[PDB]
């Protein structure tokens, strides 16, 4: 009885600690996301020059034709907005998978420098999306935006539901392509090909680390194990659903905001162009890496994502 009570105090202590660690890991995911988000947004903003097209059109008011610039502005403004939302979603899922795998590993080792080296490397792989993988996503988005919006005159008046529906159709095309096994675009956008793993580390870590890392071939094998696990998760239909859901929730928050601004101003139909401009202002809100950004807080705290994280954290049979 006494010793049974001692065991139950140990097991309580363990469950308290495991819960404390999970909770802290989830906060660390949100905090790492916010720190990386500027490194991701900058490339996208430079590539999709919504503001430069806007300035050229105004210049003309008072060299591509006006017609050309307006179709270019339509595709690029929507492309940028969905590219942000998809890349953010992929980074969120990516970090939640990475950090939860590692946290579990740590928790087990405790419950029982080379190990730390394989963890450091694994964490480095966020570079790929930040410096390459996002482009594939942008290409896929641009293609799908063309498929749905390419023929629509910017002058045309749409309701917010009509517009939401068009956005949703775009999304369903994107999703069908990026999850399609060719390894999906998701995988190739978040992870380097096998032959480029050492390259990634050489881009992200110094010679001291690389020397220590390469001294023991077990380090490379350990990283391959973590990457296999991670890739396993990324190929899973439930993870795909969650990426889509994050984007969906993003769009929802943005459109709610646009609706409120409209109602405040004065829902009547509005010209497509007006929605392009609205989206562009709201896009700016997705890129804000502030603790007070409620949209990013929401995305990082969705129930499906907690459920996923918890399944990973507790997958001891990996």
């Amino acid at each position: 009885l006494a010793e049974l009570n001692e065991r139950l105090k140990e097991e309580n202590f363990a469950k308290e600690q495991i819960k404390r660690r999970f909770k802290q890991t989830q906060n660390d995911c949100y905090m790492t996301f916010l720190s990386l988000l500027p490194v991701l947004t900058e490339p996208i903003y430079e590539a999709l020059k919504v503001e430069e097209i806007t300035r050229e059109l105004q210049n003309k008011r008072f060299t591509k034709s006006k017609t050309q610039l307006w179709n270019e502005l339509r595709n690029q403004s929507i492309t940028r907005f969905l590219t942000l939302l998809y890349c953010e979603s992929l980074l969120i899922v990516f970090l939640h998978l990475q950090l939860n795998i590692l946290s579990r590993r740590s928790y087990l080792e405790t419950a029982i420098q080379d190990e730390n080296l394989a963890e450091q490397a694994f964490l480095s792989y966020s570079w790929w999306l930040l410096n390459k993988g996002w482009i594939d996503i942008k290409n896929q988005v641009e293609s799908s935006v063309e498929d749905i919006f390419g023929d629509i005159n910017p002058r045309q008046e749409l309701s917010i539901e009509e517009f939401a529906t068009l956005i949703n159709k775009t999304q369903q095309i994107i999703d069908k392509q990026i999850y399609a096994e060719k390894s999906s675009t998701v995988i190739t956008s978040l992870l380097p090909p096998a032959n480029m793993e050492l390259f990634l580390l050489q881009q992200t870590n110094d010679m001291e680390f690389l020397t220590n890392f390469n001294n023991n071939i077990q380090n490379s094998e350990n990283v391959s194990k973590l990457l296999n696990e991670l890739k396993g998760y990324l190929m899973n239909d439930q993870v795909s659903a969650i990426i889509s859901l994050l984007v969906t929730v993003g769009i929802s928050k943005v459109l709610d905001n646009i609706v409120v601004n409209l109602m405040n101003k004065q829902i009547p139909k509005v010209k497509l162009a007006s929605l392009l401009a609205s989206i562009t202002k709201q896009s700016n809100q997705l890129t804000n890496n502030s603790l007070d950004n409620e949209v990013l807080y929401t995305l990082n705290n969705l129930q499906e994502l907690d459920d996923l994280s918890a399944s990973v954290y507790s997958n001891f049979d990996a």
Binding site: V50, E51, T54, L57, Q58, R61, K66, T67, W70, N153, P154, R155, K271, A273, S274, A277, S278, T280
Partner: peptide
């Protein structure tokens, strides 16, 4: 072409 003309106003809504 006048469709385009009317569109011109909306350029300012990008500010």
């Amino acid at each position: 072409d006048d469709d385009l003309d009317d569109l011109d106003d909306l350029l300012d809504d990008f500010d």
